[PDB]
Design a protein around this nucleic acid. Structure first.
Lengths: 79, 156, 56, 101
RNA sequence: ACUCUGGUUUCUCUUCAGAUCGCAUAAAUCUUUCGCACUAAAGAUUUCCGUGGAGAGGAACAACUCUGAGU
């Protein structure tokens, strides 16, 4: 935004609140069905294709149970 | 609210918290679309419209919608068709107006200075014979033909 | 469009000239205004207008 | 056209901002005489295609129904039509006299 | 043949609406398809242009033509 910073006061905050309320009111036209479809679509997308971090989170959490003494015991690949 | 004198918006737009002004500027394509869709018809010289204008003059929408009765609209445009053909047959040297009206950087004209007191030359209204066009000659060329008549339309 | 209308209102041109100028403006948007480059799909609309001219 | 037809039989059984369309996009390039020269509508000699000049349509119409009326109309009907045409042509001539260069 | 509701106009809010919600017609995004995608099709979503139905509220002037009911 070209007006990210500037003379912002209580009247500017009121104007921004009014215009945001107007935008919300405009979005109310199809808000329920649009948000329902968005939630269903994102849920099915996450269920079908899981992010790699999600796939490795199980092993990441199972990896917590390790002593600090074993960390120093990690060898190299010289053998 | 109620409609205000047209001189108020005139003075406001003559004289000109930036957040209000910037937020009002966002809806400009609606202003363009409502101005263009309320465009006067060739048979109208002046078309007064209800206007919702920002208090700071940053924007002004033409509030109304172009509601026209389909048979009346089609008949008016058929009469326009006849008149246009007659005029083009009459005028062999028809001159199209300059494609880019006004200078590239000519300051915009002030309506209260050179448009307010100038009356239109004429409209493209077709002449209607009273013997056959008796039921329609009273309102065939109005901004909204029977808007104020309770019998023919539902209301305002 | 507004400049053509104010030109008619001043009285310089006739109402027939005003209507013909509006027809030319709405049939020659691409020539009078550089719109097609910024939005390619708009070009389609332009052809429509020209087609409509060929129709009228 | 016949070569176009026989060809048809065989075939079936065997950037730039362009403002104006290209002529190759045209259709209705037929070989059948029944489809090239299509018999226009004569709406009983009383209906006319929209937009076109009424006088041009009257002049270029097939004049079949005019012959039909001049053959079928009785003498009184002929007099009635002649009087109506006289009055209409008088009005048209008055309009033409008013609209002169 | 006598009584009694339901009035019309306009403004605003809420909700439903697959109804040609619209006898009109745009834009964006994604996927797919063969080209090599303004000059291209398919599928889907969404946003705008603005309607209909129902309800509620406001104010404007009409109160029994009609719809009927009670006779």
């Amino acid at each position: 935004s070209l007006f990210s910073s500037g003379p912002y006061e209580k009247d500017d905050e009121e104007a921004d609140a009014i215009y945001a309320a107007l935008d919300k009111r405009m979005d109310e036209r199809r808000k329920e069905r649009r948000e329902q479809r968005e939630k269903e679509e994102i849920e099915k997308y996450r269920m079908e294709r899981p992010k790699i971090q999600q796939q490795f989170s199980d092993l990441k959490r199972k990896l917590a149970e390790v002593t600090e003494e074993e960390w120093l015991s990690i060898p190299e690949v010289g053998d | 609210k109620e409609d205000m004198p047209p001189e108020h918006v005139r003075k406001i737009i003559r004289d000109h918290d930036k957040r209000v002004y910037l937020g009002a500027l966002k809806y400009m394509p609606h202003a363009v679309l409502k101005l263009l869709e309320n465009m006067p018809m060739p048979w109208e010289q002046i078309r007064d419209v209800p206007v919702l204008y920002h208090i700071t003059g940053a924007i002004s929408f033409v509030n109304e919608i172009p509601w026209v009765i389909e048979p009346v609209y089609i008949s008016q445009w058929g009469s326009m068709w006849i008149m246009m053909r007659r005029e083009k047959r009459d005028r062999r040297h028809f001159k199209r107006m300059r494609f880019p009206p006004f200078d590239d950087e000519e300051p915009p004209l002030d309506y209260a200075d050179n448009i307010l007191d100038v009356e239109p030359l004429e409209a493209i209204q077709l002449e209607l014979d009273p013997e056959e066009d008796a039921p329609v000659l009273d309102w065939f060329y109005d901004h909204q033909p029977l808007r104020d008549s309770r019998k023919y339309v539902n209301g305002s | 469009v507004v400049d053509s209308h104010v030109q008619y209102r001043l009285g310089n041109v006739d109402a027939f000239q005003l209507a013909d100028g509006l027809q030319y403006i709405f049939a020659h948007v691409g020539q009078l205004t550089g719109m097609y480059r910024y939005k390619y799909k708009l070009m389609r609309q332009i052809r429509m207008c020209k087609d409509l001219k060929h129709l009228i | 056209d016949k070569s176009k037809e026989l060809h048809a039989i065989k075939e079936r059984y065997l950037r730039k901002f362009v403002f104006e369309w290209d002529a190759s996009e045209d259709t209705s390039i037929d070989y059948n005489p029944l489809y090239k020269e299509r018999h226009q509508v004569q709406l009983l000699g009383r209906g006319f295609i929209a937009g076109i000049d009424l006088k041009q349509q009257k002049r270029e119409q097939s004049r079949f129904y005019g012959d039909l009326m001049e053959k079928r109309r009785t003498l009184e009907e002929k007099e009635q039509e002649e009087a109506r045409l006289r009055k209409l042509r008088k009005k048209e001539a008055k309009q033409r006299w008013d609209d002169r260069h």
